[PDB]
């Protein structure tokens, strides 16, 4: 029945996930967690405090030691730093100054950078020569190119400003599988611990879940209102926290395949940049547009803690595989060590 | 006490330098942003020298490095921060653009999207008018009431180019911090890099009497 | 990555002679240097260093003030200048690179060397307990080491290194900071020890592995050297 059979087809069928999700919402994630105790206000201080940067940090990433972070900055400029002694490790010039992200691979051999470029460069931390220089070029995207992170030596992931995702072999240089579900662009991406599934999400307010390995949308969620930029993956894997642009917190999970927590604050009103679990995923950290840093509870949702030493906007923050300590780099091209 | 880690901090201090020297460079270098619909590759070819493409040239013993970001065709509002500290914005436009379908149109709805961004807020806007030669011999025979219902005037460039200039500028919503710098781009060259260059100069020097107190 | 080094020979004592090394393959402005010394029938001996960047510049007790080194990153080459150099200093010179940062690896390559001819405290002595022990292929040999003062330093790091040195040829280093191995060396040495006395253990020695072992150190600056284990197939 032409196009009409299509949407008939689509307004239908639809109705059948939100009415399956609603008679599965048994009970709220706020109605059980009630008995479990409050966190308390919670208190951090900049124990480390890093000035290389001469431009607004953009986007930056822990390593697997948990004391080597990449930081990048729109000046061209990346910064391997030694959280614990505060020297730089590393500076490499990039060809393009524009950088939106930055990935350190779990080998720690190998990082990505790239940018409104549509190529995020792969550089090698190891090489004989003893400097640090481009190893692959990903130049299969057409948009900007937003997220790219490391999933094995081997194997990365990329995030495009199109509708777009593309996972890279390092050896090939090409796209393996892509996928193309998102009708919006693509901001942030977030790996699974256990390295075989992804979510990420776009400016269309709804996070996409995807397989590495197969190589298509498995759940999706539409729970926001507004573009979201900030979405990472809870320590155990079976659920995710998404951050917008309305100042809305939202935690996914991968069981009942709809939201379960929206943190917001009627005083907050600014857009939201990265979002970042604990070790635990017991406390959630999330980057705000309002020169201002704040920390939410997974369970009870509460203001834990405020972290306002950053003048201008927090564009992304980390946590440590072991949770050690906090790092958090804004427009200031300063970064802050909270824990 | 330290072992290794005195030559490790000074790395970083020999790192630091380096980058201080190469922030002092960046610094000593202006940066300009390229607008436009379609038109702007004459402009390119004009100021001698996938993706964005960045172009670099020195003029006057002035280091100009310039940015096309016209071919992104994506959304403009998840990375137009980037450019916040751009020196100018080059806007090139089209005038023959009113007899193509509605064009000139989305060009001012461009033009407005960028005058009142809250990023560009204290940045000049560069205004190019290509195809000079085209409306020159076009405007006699079409009408420029075609786009412009409430204009009446005769059909002269003069009157033409005038009520163009009324219009764009027109739609800055803030005409204390901006400095719209109008120009009609001309076939031959070493003149369309003079108005450039006197363009971000005077940008700077407002931009020094700011910083002293005077702007 | 090649450092070709020139200007030995016999010089009468108390001349002047001046030792240029080559660097080719790698960022030697980056790469701080190391100019170390062998007697034909003693081991090794450190001699000078200088930083990457000719900021910090070392000399050995025994060379303090006589010696001058520079570099010359356009022209990329590393001069050592001695004078007045007496009977005791004939030896078989080296030049290593080294970078120091978090997970690097100094000292990993190693100059072909140039042989050097003259016509007739507060240091930390490594006590080796050996000076030569029997081998046989396919089978683990453990050596052990001792060291004056306790190398754990407050950083959790210890500072020792293992060297390879095959007969005929250029110094290798197997494993840096006592925990990890350097590239390209086999995964079957290992180290182990409690920051005081130390222990390398081989399994599965082949015919390459034959060589002499050297232990450095670096929780101070006098970088002394052991006097070495000779290794008979």
């Known amino acids: 029945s032409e196009l009409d059979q299509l949407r008939q087809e689509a307004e239908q069928l639809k109705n059948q996930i939100r009415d399956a999700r609603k008679a599965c919402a048994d009970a709220t994630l706020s109605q059980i967690t009630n008995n479990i105790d409050p966190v308390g206000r919670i208190q951090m201080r900049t124990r480390r405090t890093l000035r290389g940067h001469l431009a607004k940090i953009y986007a930056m990433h822990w390593g697997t030691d948990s004391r080597l972070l990449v930081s990048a900055s729109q000046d061209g400029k990346l910064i391997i730093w030694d959280s614990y002694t505060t020297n730089k490790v590393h500076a490499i010039p990039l060809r393009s100054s524009w950088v939106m992200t930055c990935a350190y691979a779990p080998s720690g051999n190998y990082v990505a950078c790239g940018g409104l470029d549509n190529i995020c460069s792969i550089y090698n931390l190891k090489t004989r020569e003893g400097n640090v220089r481009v190893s692959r070029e990903l130049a299969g995207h057409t948009g900007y190119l937003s997220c790219c992170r490391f999933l094995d030596d081997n194997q990365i992931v990329t995030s495009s400003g199109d509708t777009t995702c593309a996972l890279w072999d390092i050896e090939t240089g090409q796209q393996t599988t892509t996928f193309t579900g998102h009708t919006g662009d693509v901001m942030s991406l977030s790996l699974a611990p256990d390295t075989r599934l992804f979510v990420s999400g776009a400016c269309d307010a709804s996070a996409k879940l995807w397989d590495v390995r197969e190589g298509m949308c498995r759940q999706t969620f539409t729970g926001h209102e507004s573009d979201i930029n900030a979405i990472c993956f809870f320590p155990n894997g079976n659920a995710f926290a998404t951050g917008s642009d309305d100042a809305t917190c939202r935690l996914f999970d991968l069981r009942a395949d709809q939201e379960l927590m929206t943190y917001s604050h009627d005083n907050i009103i600014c857009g939201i940049t990265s979002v970042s679990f604990s070790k635990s995923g017991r406390l959630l950290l999330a980057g705000y547009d309002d020169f201002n840093c704040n920390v939410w509870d997974a369970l009870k949702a509460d203001r834990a803690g405020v972290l306002a030493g950053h003048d201008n906007r927090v564009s992304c923050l980390g946590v440590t595989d072991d949770g050690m300590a906090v790092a958090t780099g804004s427009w200031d091209s300063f970064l802050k060590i909270w824990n | 006490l330290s072992a290794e880690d005195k030559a490790a901090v000074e790395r970083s201090k020999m790192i630091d330098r380096n980058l201080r020297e190469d922030g002092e460079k960046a610094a000593r270098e202006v940066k300009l942003l390229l607008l436009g619909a379609g038109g702007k590759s004459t402009i390119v070819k004009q100021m001698k020298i996938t993706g964005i493409v960045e172009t670099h040239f020195t003029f006057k013993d002035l280091h100009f490095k310039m940015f096309d970001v016209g071919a992104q065709r994506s959304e403009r509002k998840k990375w137009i921060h980037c450019f916040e500290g751009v020196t100018a914005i080059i806007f090139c436009v089209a005038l023959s653009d009113y007899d193509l379908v509605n064009r000139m149109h989305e060009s001012m709805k461009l033009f407005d999207s960028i005058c009142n961004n809250k990023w560009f807020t204290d940045t000049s806007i560069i205004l190019f008018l290509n195809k000079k030669d085209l409306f020159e011999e076009k405007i006699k025979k079409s009408p420029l009431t075609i786009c412009y219902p409430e204009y009446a005037g005769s059909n002269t460039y003069e009157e033409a180019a005038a009520y163009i200039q009324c219009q764009f500028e027109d739609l800055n919503k803030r005409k204390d911090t901006k400095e719209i710098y109008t120009h009609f781009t001309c076939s031959t060259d070493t003149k369309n890099v003079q108005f450039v260059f006197d363009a971000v100069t005077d940008v700077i020097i407002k931009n020094n009497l700011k910083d002293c107190g005077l702007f | 990555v090649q450092l070709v080094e020139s200007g030995g020979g016999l010089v009468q004592p108390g001349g002047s002679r001046k030792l240029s090394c080559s660097a080719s393959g790698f960022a030697f402005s980056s790469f701080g240097m190391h100019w170390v010394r062998q007697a034909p029938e003693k081991g090794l001996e450190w001699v000078a260093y200088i930083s990457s960047g000719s900021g910090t510049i070392y000399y050995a007790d025994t060379v303090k003030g006589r010696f001058t080194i520079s570099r010359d990153d356009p022209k990329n080459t590393l001069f050592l200048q001695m004078t007045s150099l007496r009977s005791e200093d004939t030896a078989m010179y080296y030049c290593?690179?080294?970078?120091?940062?978090?997970?690097?690896?100094?000292?990993?390559?190693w100059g072909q060397g140039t042989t050097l001819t003259v016509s007739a405290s507060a240091d930390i002595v490594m006590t080796q307990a050996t000076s030569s022990v029997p081998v046989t292929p396919g089978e683990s040999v453990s050596i052990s080491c001792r060291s004056s003062?306790?190398?754990?330093?407050?950083?959790?790091?210890?500072?020792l290194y293992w060297f390879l040195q095959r007969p005929g040829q250029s110094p290798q280093l197997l494993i840096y900071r006592m925990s990890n191995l350097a590239s390209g060396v086999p995964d079957r040495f290992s180290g182990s020890g409690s920051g005081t006395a130390f222990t390398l253990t081989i399994s599965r020695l082949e015919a390459e592995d034959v060589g002499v072992y050297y232990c450095?150190?670096?929780?101070?600056?006098?970088?002394?050297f052991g006097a070495g284990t000779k290794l008979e197939l």
């Open positions: 450095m150190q670096h929780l101070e600056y006098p970088l002394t």
């Open positions: 003062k306790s190398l754990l330093h407050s950083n959790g790091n210890t500072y």
């Open positions: 290593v690179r080294s970078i120091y940062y978090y997970g690097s690896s100094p000292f990993d390559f």
